[PDB]
Curated annotation (Swiss-Prot), chains A, B:
Belongs to the small GTPase superfamily. Rab family. Mg(2+) binds at residues 21, 39, 62. A motif (Switch 1) lies at residues 30-44. Its cofactor is Mg(2+). GO terms for cellular component: actin cytoskeleton; centriolar satellite; centriole; centrosome; ciliary basal body; ciliary base; ciliary membrane; cilium. Regulated by guanine nucleotide exchange factors (GEFs) such as RAB3IP/Rabin8 and RPGR which promote the exchange of bound GDP for free GTP, GTPase activating proteins (GAPs) which increase the GTP hydrolysis activity, and GDP dissociation inhibitors (GDIs) which inhibit the dissociation of the nucleotide from the GTPase. Activated in response to insulin. Interacts (GTP-bound form) with MICALL1; regulates RAB8A association with recycling endosomes. Interacts with MICALL2; competes with RAB13 and is involved in E-cadherin endocytic recycling. Interacts (GTP-bound form) with MICAL1, MICALCL, MICAL3, EHBP1 and EHBP1L1; at least in case of MICAL1, MICALCL, MICAL3 and EHBP1L1 two molecules of RAB8A can bind to one molecule of the effector protein; ternary complexes of RAB8A, RAB13 and either MICAL1 or EHBP1L1 are possible. Interacts with EHD1. Interacts with MAP4K2 and SYTL4. Interacts with SGSM1 and SGSM3. A motif (Switch 2) lies at residues 62-79. It comes from Homo sapiens. This is Ras-related protein Rab-8A.
From Swiss-Prot, chains C, D:
This is Optineurin. The lineage of its organism: Eukaryota, Metazoa, Chordata, Craniata, Vertebrata. Self-associates. Interacts with HD. Interacts with GTF3A. Interacts with MYO6. Interacts (via UBAN) with ubiquitinated TFRC. Interacts with GTP-bound Rab8 (RAB8A and/or RAB8B). Interacts with TBC1D17. Interacts with TBK1. Interacts with TRAF3. Binds to linear ubiquitin chains. Interacts with LC3 family members MAP1LC3A, MAP1LC3B, GABARAP, GABARAPL1 and GABARAPL2; OPTN phosphorylation increases the association (at least with MAP1LC3B). Interacts with RAB12; the interaction may be indirect. It is linked to Glaucoma 1, open angle, E: A form of primary open angle glaucoma (POAG). POAG is characterized by a specific pattern of optic nerve and visual field defects. The angle of the anterior chamber of the eye is open, and usually the intraocular pressure is increased. However, glaucoma can occur at any intraocular pressure. The disease is generally asymptomatic until the late stages, by which time significant and irreversible optic nerve damage has already taken place. Induction: Up-regulated by TNF. Up-regulated by IFNG. TNF and IFNG act synergistically to stimulate OPTN expression. Induced by glucocorticoids, such as dexamethasone. In an in vitro experimental setting, in which donor eyes are subjected to increased perfusion pressure (10 to 30 mm Hg) in the anterior chamber, there is no up-regulation in the trabecular meshwork at the transcript level for periods ranging between 1 and 24 hours. However, exposure to continuous elevated pressure for several days shows an induction of OPTN expression, with a 56% increase after 7 days. It comes from Homo sapiens. Phosphorylated by TBK1, leading to restrict bacterial proliferation in case of infection. Phosphorylation is induced by phorbol esters and decreases its half-time. Present in aqueous humor of the eye (at protein level). Expressed in the trabecular meshwork (at protein level). Expressed in nonpigmented ciliary epithelium (at protein level). Expressed at high levels in skeletal muscle, also detected in heart, brain, pancreas, kidney, placenta and liver. Expressed in dermal fibroblasts (at protein level). Ubiquitin-binding motif (UBAN), also called UBD, is essential for subcellular localization to recycling endosomes and for proper trafficking of transferrin to the juxtanuclear region. It is involved in interaction with ubiquitinated TFRC. The LIR (LC3-interacting region) motif mediates the interaction with ATG8 family proteins.
Amino acid sequence: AKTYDYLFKLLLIGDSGVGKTCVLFRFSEDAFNSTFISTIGIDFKIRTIELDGKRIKLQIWDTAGLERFRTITTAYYRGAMGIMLVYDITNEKSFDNIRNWIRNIEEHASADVEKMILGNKCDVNDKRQVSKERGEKLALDYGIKFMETSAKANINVENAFFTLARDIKAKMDKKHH
Amino acid sequence: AKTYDYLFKLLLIGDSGVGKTCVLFRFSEDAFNSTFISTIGIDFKIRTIELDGKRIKLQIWDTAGLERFRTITTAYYRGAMGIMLVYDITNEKSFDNIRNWIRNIEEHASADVEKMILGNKCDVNDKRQVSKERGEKLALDYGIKFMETSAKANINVENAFFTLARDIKAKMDKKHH
Amino acid sequence: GPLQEKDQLRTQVVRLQAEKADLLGIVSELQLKLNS
Amino acid sequence: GPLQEKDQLRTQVVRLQAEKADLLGIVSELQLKLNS
Ligand SMILES: Nc1nc2c(ncn2[C@@H]2O[C@H](COP(=O)(O)OP(=O)(O)OP(=O)(O)O)[C@@H](O)[C@H]2O)c(=O)[nH]1
Ligand SMILES: Nc1nc2c(ncn2[C@@H]2O[C@H](COP(=O)(O)OP(=O)(O)OP(=O)(O)O)[C@@H](O)[C@H]2O)c(=O)[nH]1
Ligand SMILES: [Mg+2]
Ligand SMILES: [Mg+2]
C-alpha cells in the first residue's frame, strides 16, 4: 500500500557547523550527537507526519554548508517546497550570512517556496552572539517565519518542521480549491 | 580514504523469477531466501573484490524482469560495463528469451560491454528443462561466456562475478597500454 | 542494553531500507528525464 | 542467537549506509548532468 497522501521535499541550508544535520537527526530519529561530522555534499532523511488527518511524507535533504559543495547542493534547490535557513546563535557570522543564503534561494529555488529561519543552539546561553530580537528582526525584514531551536535539548525542532509542513499544505490545499 | 582502485558497473537482466536477486544476494551477502519478492523496478548492491592486488568496487544493479518495468530498467543499460544475462534451467521460456535480452543489450548498452550468460537453479536437477549442452551452444552462437549457477547451493556465483570482473579489468588494462 | 541495542539496530535497518527505496526511485526518474 | 542477530544487524546497517552513500553521489551527479 501507498504510505502517504502528500509528499513534501524539504531542504536545510546554512553555514557549516550551525547544526543542520543535528537538527534533522533530532527530528528524524530523536537523537543528538556532539561529535562534528561535516556533511559530504548532501544527506537524506525521511519522516512521515500527520496533518489534518492526512499522512505527510517529508523527504528532507540536508545540504553541506561549505562553499566547496556549492555546485552539488545548489542543484537540490529546484524541487524544494520548503527550506530551513539555519544559523548558530553562538556564531554571528553564520547569522550575517543568512542574507546570502536567502539570495541563493531566490536565484535557484521556486519563487513561491516556503521558507523558515532557525536560530539553532539556543541551549548554549553562555556563548550567544546573536540576540533573539535580532533574529526576529531579520526574519521580519524578509517576511519569513522565525524560531530559535536546540537539536541538543529538543526545543522547537518538532514545531519548526510541523509549521513549515503546515504552510506548504495550506498553500497546496488553496491551489486545489 | 578512497576504498577502491577500479569501479565497475554491473547489471543483471533476464525474465522475472529466474533468480537475479537471489544470485546477487548470494554474492553480496552469502545468503539465500526461498520466498519470492519480485523486484520493483531496480535494486542495488555493492561488493569490493581484489584482482591483481587491486581493489575492485562492483556497483551491481539488479533489474526487474517484468516487461512492465522496461522503461525504468532500460535506462540503466547505458553505463554498464558488464551484464549478466540470467535464465532458469527449469524454465525453457526464460532460456528462449535470452536471445531477446541480447538484442535489448545491443540496442541500449555500449557496443563493447562485457557479457555473460548464467543458467541458474542448476541445483533443481529434477525439474531441469534446458540441458547444459543447449546453454553452452546458445552462448557459443553469440560468442558469450556461459556458466550454470545455483544461488541456493552457492555454485559458480563467485566464479561468475569474478570472471566478468576479470574480463572488464583485462579490457581496461589493455586500453591503458 | 543488548536488546535495546538490537531494537535500535532493527529500527535503523528499516529506516535505511526506506531511504534506499526512495533514492532508487529518484535515480530511476532522473535517468528517464536525462534520456529525453 | 541474539549476538549473532546483533552482529548481522550491525553488518546490515554498514552495508545499507554504504549503498546510501553511493546512491546520494549518483543522485547529485545526475542532477548536475540535468542542469546542463
Ligand atoms: N549545544 C548544541 N550543539 C549543537 C546543536 N546543534 C548542533 N550542535 C553541534 O554543532 C556541531 C555542528 O553540527 P552539525 O549538525 O553537524 O552542523 P552542520 O550544519 O550539519 O554542518 P555541515 O554539515 O558542515 O554543513 C556538532 O558538533 C553538534 O554537536 C545544538 O542545538 N546545541
Ligand atoms: N532452488 C533454487 N531456487 C532459486 C535459485 N535462485 C532463485 N531461486 C528461487 O527463485 C525465485 C525467484 O528468485 P529471484 O531472485 O527473486 O527472481 P528475479 O530474477 O530477481 O525475479 P524479478 O525480480 O521479478 O525479475 C525465488 O523464490 C528463489 O527462491 C536457485 O539457485 N535455486
Ligand atoms: Mg551536516
Ligand atoms: Mg529480483
